[PDB]
């Protein structure tokens, strides 16, 4: 699935910690639970934050540099030493028996996948007039847009969707095609580039009722 940045922000506590980095959303809760010391501070303090600036794209490990004091290459950790980072000097307590760093152990600490962009859909329930703005990832199939909208109407499954596809006529939308395939384009970049407010026009999704019993 996918997550908007705000959705990642909802979990910021040592009890439920989510971090987004390099396009991936990670639930580091069991880490903080199993490693509770001064090591866990720099990422507790960035719970629910975006952690991509720590790392580099070419390799999945954090950035490295030549340490000015010892002149030995090691991770650049201005924030502090996060879990799975070796101490600068030869110690007697940092074991290397553990398998993989948490930024490499995707299978055990990654859930979902961070959205690279988000858009505003204005959903309108045609039977009982109830407008509603909402933010959804700009790359998602209508099934999960319906899943997002299920918090607005608990009976949205029975309803049928419709969009102003192109002249322009309100036509049906296939569920498995994303908002861009179905003909609902995104124009916020053009809005910005042309000095038009990003809340001036919003694409609209009509939601009619399908009688059932």
């Amino acid at each position: 699935r996918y997550y908007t940045p705000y959705e990642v922000a909802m979990h910021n506590t040592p009890d439920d910690c989510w971090v987004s980095f390099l396009g991936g959303v990670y639930n580091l809760t069991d880490l903080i639970k199993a490693n509770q010391g001064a090591l866990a501070a720099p990422l507790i303090a960035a719970a629910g934050q975006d952690l991509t600036h720590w790392f580099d794209p070419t390799t999945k490990d954090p950035k490295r540099h030549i340490c000015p004091a010892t002149h030995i290459e090691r991770f650049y950790t201005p924030m502090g030493r996060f879990i799975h980072v070796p101490p600068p000097e030869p110690m007697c307590n940092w074991d290397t028996s553990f398998g993989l760093p948490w930024w490499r152990d995707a299978k055990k600490y990654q859930i979902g996948l961070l959205s690279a962009r988000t858009r505003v859909i204005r959903v309108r329930n045609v039977l009982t007039d109830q407008e509603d703005q909402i933010e959804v990832p700009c790359e998602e199939k209508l099934v999960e847009i319906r899943e997002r909208y299920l918090e607005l109407n608990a009976h949205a499954k029975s309803y049928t969707w419709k969009a102003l596809v192109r002249t322009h006529v309100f036509q049906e939308l296939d569920l498995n095609l994303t908002l861009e395939e179905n003909g609902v384009p995104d124009e916020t970049p053009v809005f910005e580039d042309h000095h038009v407010p990003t809340d001036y026009f919003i694409p609209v999704l009509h939601v009619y009722w399908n009688d059932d019993l």
Partner: protein, 52 residues
């Protein structure tokens, strides 16, 4: 004394037949007016959706 039974028969026919006809006409008129009312509601709702 001899025209009385003819009067009774014809008057009975007229009364019962007229009463039955008026009741049934009224009853159908009421039902069809109710149906037309519901259809009018539906048409108004259609017009509202088209307007939006």
């Amino acid at each position: 004394f001899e025209v009385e039974p003819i009067l009774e028969v014809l008057v009975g026919k007229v009364l019962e037949q007229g009463l039955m006809e008026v009741l049934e006409e009224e009853e159908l008129a009421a039902m069809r007016a109710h149906q037309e009312h519901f259809e009018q509601i539906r048409n108004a709702e259609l017009v509202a959706t088209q307007r939006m």
